Amino acid sequence: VDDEELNAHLLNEEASKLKERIWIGLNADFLLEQESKRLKQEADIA
Amino acid sequence: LSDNAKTLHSQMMSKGIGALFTQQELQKQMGIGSLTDLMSIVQELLDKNLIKLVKQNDELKFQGVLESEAQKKATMSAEEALVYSYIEASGREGIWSKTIKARTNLHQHVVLKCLKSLESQRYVKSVKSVKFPTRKIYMLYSLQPSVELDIEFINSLLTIVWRFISENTQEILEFITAAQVANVELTPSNIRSLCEVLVYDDKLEKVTHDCYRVTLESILQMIFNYFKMFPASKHDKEVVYFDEWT
């Protein structure tokens, strides 16, 4: 059930690091997730 | 103005935190001004909430604290930092949550909503204390559980020390170091406590105020012979009971 346009459905390879810089420029949810995940280990010895 | 306050706190942080300072040496140390304007910058330094006023009994006493904890408590609001002062005043033995409510007049909801935020600020932990179980005890991260261990598995320590005396208090202390025993701190007082449980069971005997001899329970271990005494207990109405007289 192949085709040609969904076969072309794939990223812009030179606009990858263009796009994730925008995606990382909007995101902070995993940021505070990280030091809370780092807090899961800190409360183990506390 | 500011520079006179910069000199005095450098004198407060000059000495190691002990030897709590007072005024009678402070005017000897910083007496370039009269007492009328010396107090006014210290009350302004109280307005800059660095100096605190500690108490040695029946008299007036001062104590300076570091700038590092002063900045983090300035992030809090009025009531937020106010309750944080009570826990850090306790310090070593914790403090009970209901007693904190008594020293504030803040009722049960507003105190619990404050410290819910305060644990996320990583300044306060909750420990389980044993001299009054199931009470809320708060400390810093400085970890003073001054209040061996209450839960079981003392018998694993206890059953081996009988075997050392079976073949026949200072002689125990070298033996307990080896054999990968799961211990962290022993003391000659603990072995004295560990031995007298066996005295109450008559597993061995106390002679000459520190020596110990075995009461020959080994032949009982393997009328005063309670082992191998199995009863009939079925289809026999003519048995003897110790109860059923009351």
Side-chain angles (χ1 to χ4, degrees):
Chain A
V1 290
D2 293 327
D3 52 358
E4 69 275 13
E5 181 62 37
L6 191 142
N7 198 359
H9 182 76
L10 191 272
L11 78 150
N12 196 357
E13 293 86 0
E14 71 271 15
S16 178
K17 76 279 191 185
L18 185 147
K19 189 260 290 182
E20 292 105 20
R21 183 177 63 84
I22 302 301
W23 185 72
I24 209 68
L26 55 88
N27 195 356
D29 175 72
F30 80 101
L31 185 147
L32 81 153
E33 180 184 1
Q34 180 63 254
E35 80 263 9
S36 68
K37 185 178 179 180
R38 295 282 79 79
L39 196 272
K40 302 296 186 293
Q41 194 276 129
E42 182 66 29
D44 291 332
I45 49 94
Chain B
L1 184 65
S2 296
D3 54 355
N4 196 1
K6 300 301 181 290
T7 56
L8 58 87
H9 82 283
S10 64
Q11 180 62 41
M12 294 301 108
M13 277 66 258
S14 64
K15 196 182 264 77
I17 194 66
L20 67 174
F21 287 167
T22 187
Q23 194 271 331
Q24 299 297 320
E25 62 185 1
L26 182 63
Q27 190 175 2
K28 184 259 188 294
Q29 190 64 256
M30 293 300 292
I32 188 65
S34 178
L35 193 272
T36 59
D37 63 358
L38 286 173
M39 184 184 289
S40 65
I41 196 67
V42 174
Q43 189 174 2
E44 196 273 332
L45 208 280
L46 282 168
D47 289 331
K48 287 180 92 288
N49 65 17
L50 192 276
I51 189 73
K52 67 182 291 296
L53 202 152
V54 78
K55 280 81 181 166
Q56 184 59 256
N57 52 2
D58 297 330
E59 53 92 25
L60 191 274
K61 187 70 76 176
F62 284 162
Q63 182 178 1
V65 300
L66 272 298
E67 193 270 330
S68 67
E69 67 271 15
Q71 194 277 127
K72 65 178 179 65
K73 69 102 175 180
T75 308
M76 304 298 173
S77 74
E79 58 91 19
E80 288 170 352
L82 193 274
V83 64
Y84 180 74
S85 56
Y86 277 159
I87 175 178
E88 67 184 1
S90 65
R92 298 292 89 192
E93 66 274 16
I95 192 63
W96 185 49
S97 176
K98 184 73 173 178
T99 315
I100 291 298
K101 191 266 295 180
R103 294 189 181 96
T104 58
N105 295 317
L106 304 174
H107 66 89
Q108 289 83 13
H109 180 267
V110 64
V111 59
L112 266 297
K113 184 57 70 179
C114 183
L115 60 93
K116 186 187 287 185
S117 176
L118 191 62
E119 58 87 19
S120 68
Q121 298 303 109
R122 299 289 94 188
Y123 296 151
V124 48
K125 67 182 183 292
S126 66
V127 299
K128 180 66 176 293
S129 177
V130 296
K131 292 301 289 183
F132 194 85
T134 321
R135 79 189 302 168
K136 300 303 289 291
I137 295 301
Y138 297 157
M139 291 186 288
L140 298 171
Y141 284 170
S142 65
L143 194 139
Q144 185 62 258
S146 177
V147 61
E148 180 67 30
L149 196 274
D150 293 330
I151 315 297
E152 209 263 334
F153 288 162
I154 301 101
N155 56 1
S156 65
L157 287 77
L158 183 143
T159 186
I160 302 298
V161 71
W162 182 65
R163 300 287 179 87
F164 181 75
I165 311 298
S166 70
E167 55 90 19
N168 206 167
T169 184
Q170 291 300 112
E171 67 271 14
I172 309 298
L173 293 172
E174 295 87 5
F175 184 76
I176 60 172
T177 307
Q180 65 180 358
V181 56
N183 56 0
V184 285
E185 287 93 6
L186 265 300
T187 186
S189 177
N190 210 171
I191 303 299
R192 181 179 289 174
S193 178
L194 259 291
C195 187
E196 301 300 321
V197 178
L198 287 309
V199 177
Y200 291 157
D201 293 330
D202 287 331
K203 304 292 283 292
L204 69 153
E205 192 269 340
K206 178 194 291 295
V207 65
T208 67
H209 188 273
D210 205 5
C211 187
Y212 292 102
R213 295 300 297 266
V214 182
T215 59
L216 63 154
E217 200 272 338
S218 65
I219 50 96
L220 195 150
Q221 186 269 332
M222 64 88 205
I223 42 93
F224 287 166
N225 45 6
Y226 296 148
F227 60 100
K228 84 262 191 186
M229 295 297 172
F230 60 95
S233 294
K234 297 298 288 184
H235 297 285
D236 194 359
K237 297 177 184 179
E238 293 83 3
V239 297
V240 176
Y241 288 157
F242 180 72
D243 55 355
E244 65 90 28
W245 184 61
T246 63

